């Protein structure tokens, strides 16, 4: 009896077996019906994302994603495997119940559990108190956590994440005459972003370096032989995280949302939050982002405050890894919701 961990994101499903060090299955959270990699290759049906900004919004398509996960990706019988799922911070109660109902009634799992994504990322770093910045394809959150409890008044949601950065790179690539328009082309630009982009330690100074020579330029070649060369676009793209005005958003940037979130917590915990800033999710992978965040938070915090940013190399899968850890601890085993409990009490048991 081996537990499964399924971490459902706006852009990517990460799934696998509890006890493994990484998800074996990672695929696009897309329904075209076709699911995942199948759907993109056969773009031609239309593509829908059943999770928007971290929240499940299309339950029929979400069910196809879970089915594809169990049967085609992991090749398991779900009725034999306790299953740990993940949810966004502030996921409405109704959504949690419906996830529980689908798992027990449609997939017949013997047991299940739903954990908050940011909390899992904190656990993966060995911590039970800290503040997580979780930034994926569709949403970014700041989640302060006290001994495993996400502090609900201090959680911040920011609708600025990887897909917005990809779209912004598509826009600014036109300055050099390049044209990427198609959804297929968006996938190309996504990969360019991932390969060439970085966070400047100081933006204004980096802009000056980029204007004064070509030393910051890098190139990416498409299969047809087109060479895409960019300079300041490399760091302007993720700068958006720190300056959302780049894409017409009024919001504060991620450094400030981190600070604001800490400031909505009791003063007596702020020290431990400042010293345990954990970075999670694919959009935190930009080289230089940890050092920039350290600098920005330092500029916002009390002058004597010890500031520490933890950015693990595995952080594209930290949520998933935290679930894998949690689900295989002997001390967690009594916390599964069992099919017997669901059978007697129904969906609302999940809030227990």
């Amino acid at each position: 009896t081996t537990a499964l961990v399924c971490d459902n994101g706006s852009g990517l499903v990460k799934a696998g077996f509890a006890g493994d060090d990484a998800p074996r299955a990672v695929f696009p959270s897309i329904v075209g019906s076709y699911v995942g990699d199948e759907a993109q290759s056969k773009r031609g049906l239309t593509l829908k994302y059943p999770i928007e900004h971290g929240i499940i919004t299309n339950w029929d398509d979400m069910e196809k994603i879970w089915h594809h996960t169990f049967y085609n990706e992991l090749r398991v019988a779900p009725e034999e495997h306790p299953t740990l799922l993940t949810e966004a911070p502030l996921n409405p109660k109704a959504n949690r119940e419906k996830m529980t109902q689908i798992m027990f009634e449609t997939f017949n799992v013997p047991a299940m559990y739903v954990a908050i994504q940011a909390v899992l990322s904190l656990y993966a770093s060995g911590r039970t108190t800290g503040i997580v910045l979780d930034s994926g394809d569709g949403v970014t959150h700041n989640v302060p956590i006290y001994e495993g409890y996400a502090l609900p008044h201090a959680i911040m949601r920011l609708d600025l994440a990887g897909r917005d950065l990809t779209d912004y790179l598509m826009k600014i690539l036109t300055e050099r005459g390049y044209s990427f328009v198609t959804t297929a082309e968006r996938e190309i630009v996504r990969d360019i972003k991932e390969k060439l982009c970085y966070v400047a330690l100081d933006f204004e100074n980096e802009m000056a370096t980029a204007a004064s020579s070509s030393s910051l330029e890098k190139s990416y070649e498409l299969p047809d032989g087109q060479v895409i060369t960019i300079g300041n676009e490399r760091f302007r793209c993720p700068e958006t995280l720190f300056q959302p005005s780049f894409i017409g958003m009024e919001s504060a940037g991620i450094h400030e949302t981190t600070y604001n979130s800490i400031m909505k917590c009791d003063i007596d915990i702020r020290k431990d939050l400042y010293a345990n800033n954990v970075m999670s999710g694919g959009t935190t992978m930009y080289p230089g982002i940890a050092d920039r965040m350290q600098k920005e938070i330092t500029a916002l915090a009390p002058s004597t405050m010890k500031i520490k940013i933890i950015a693990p190399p595995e952080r594209k899968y930290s949520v998933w890894i935290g679930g894998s850890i949690l689900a295989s601890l002997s001390t967690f085993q009594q916390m599964w919701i069992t099919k017997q409990e669901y059978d007697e009490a129904g969906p609302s048991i999940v809030h227990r």
């Binding site: 993966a124 911590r127 001994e147 890894i321 601890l329 001390t331």
Partner: peptide, 22 residues
């Protein structure tokens, strides 16, 4: 308590290095 045992296990889990290599 229940939670202190889980919390302690999380602190001493050793992270991904103690999980199975895929």
């Amino acid at each position: 308590s229940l939670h202190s045992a889980l919390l302690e296990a999380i602190h001493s889990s050793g992270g991904r290095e103690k999980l199975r290599k895929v």
